[PDB]
């Protein structure tokens, strides 16, 4: 986590309005996610975000990547992989590393 706080906080600052970020969830479509190479990363299910630090136009998040399962008499999402990322004002996730599979 700490080296990702380092990378994030090194984004140069600017006086602007605060953005409202997209709080993606098991209920919602995950946003487009990209690896540090620029390659599209396609998740096998939805994601949940945990904000770590925030900048007016970008924030740092922990991205939890899920895989839907058979539970009870229905289905719901349980965990698969995680990645630290920054998110911008189009809601896009920029991963700092390939997702760690749990």
């Amino acid at each position: 986590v700490e080296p990702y706080i380092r990378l994030f906080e090194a984004i140069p600052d600017a006086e602007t309005e605060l953005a409202t970020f997209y709080d993606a969830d098991l209920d919602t479509l995950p946003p487009r996610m990209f690896l540090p190479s620029g390659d599209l990363y396609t998740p096998p299910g939805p994601v949940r975000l945990e904000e770590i630090k925030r900048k007016r136009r970008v924030r740092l998040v922990k991205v939890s990547i899920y895989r839907f399962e058979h539970v009870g008499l229905g289905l719901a999402a349980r965990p698969y992989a995680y990645a630290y990322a920054w998110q911008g004002d189009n809601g896009i996730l920029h991963l700092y590393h390939a997702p760690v599979v749990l």
Binding site: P12, A14, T16, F34, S37, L40, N90
Partner: protein, 129 residues
């Protein structure tokens, strides 16, 4: 040659497909390409710029083709759909470049600001050469 100061400019305007936006949050771009951009997507003062490098990040709405049968099935269960953007950033032209020495950013509706009809915001970048 004697100091020759360039002036680069980009406007984000309202569109029938939805608003263009100045931003850092641009898809399919490697970290290196985003390296010198402030949090607003505007290139930082004191930065060398080379042909193809970004001065001002911008995204526009693309696409809106009718949904696939797949993307409709989901459109009920996983949540209502959402929309795709493309990189339409201001990039240093071929045969140019140098050091960023100033930036100017204006937003429609700020006090005293008068932009062209349709324009939400405008950014200018000045570079040495």
């Amino acid at each position: 040659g004697p100091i020759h100061i360039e002036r680069y400019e980009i406007e984000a305007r309202d569109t029938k497909l939805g608003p263009e936006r100045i931003t850092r949050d641009i898809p399919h771009l490697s970290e290196a390409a985003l390296r010198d951009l402030d949090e607003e997507g505007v290139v930082r003062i004191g930065a060398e710029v080379k042909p193809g490098d970004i001065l001002v990040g911008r995204t526009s709405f693309k696409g809106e083709s009718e949904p696939t049968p797949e993307e409709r099935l989901l459109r009920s269960i996983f949540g209502e759909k959402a929309r795709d953007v493309k990189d339409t950033s201001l990039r240093v032209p071929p045969g140019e470049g140098g050091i960023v020495v100033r930036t100017v950013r204006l937003r429609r509706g700020d006090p005293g600001v008068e932009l062209k009809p349709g324009v939400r915001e405008v950014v200018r970048v000045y570079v040495a050469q």
